[PDB]
Amino acid sequence: SFVGKKYKLDKSENFDEYMKELGVGLVTRKMGNSLSPTVEVTLEGDTYTLTTTSTFKTSAISFKLGVEFDEETLDGRNVKSIITLDGNKLTQEQKGDKPTTIVREFTDNELITTLTIGNVKCVRVYKA
Template identity: 60%
Template sequence: MPEVWEGKSYENYESHNFNEYMIELGVGFFTRQIGNALTPTVSLEKNGNIYKLTTSSTFKTQVLEFELGKEFDETTLDDRQVKSICTMEGNTLIQQQGGAKPGTITREFSATEMIATMKVGNVTCIRKYKAV
């Protein structure tokens, strides 16, 4: 039986505290302006034990390939080099990011929506995506 997210892409339609989240990460003004103007699309695929999380926009595309529970190297969309570990609980993908400013990105997938809750320091950002 396929997962609710298989074969779907999710497009960002609403963000709360995204600018504050980027400020907490130390993202520069110019990059924040671009990030705030974009409406990225996210998709998640699985091939055997390998997951592929793709985030794409008109500015940049990031493809993360990983196995659940195994640390991997990540270059974030704002070009930070971090170590990440992803786990899956039901239809929720939990990503722990290391680095100078460690944080957590929790992506809750449903058939019609994906909600990303992003936490770093004392800042929480919520970004909502609709299935397209």
């Protein structure tokens, strides 16, 4: 239902704090605050690709749902992650020493992304 739909950032709360807690450096963090990236989930056969695109960089990560994989974090660590699907909610868990959950709820026409690290909840809303 949400595959192949492209969403662009419309509003964000607490992303600076999420990045700071994640360990992102001062300049990257201030740059990241002001970007308006797009998100798109695509699928071919068994393999999903979650593509987040800013004017500087594309992060396109491919994964099989419910199969654990290794992932680079924004602050430069390699962590084990797993992504699962429950209806319209795509949930990403990162293990390791900065555990995080990123829940992407597609409403049909908008995407609501809730990012949790420590006591920080970030909410980012993207629209088609």
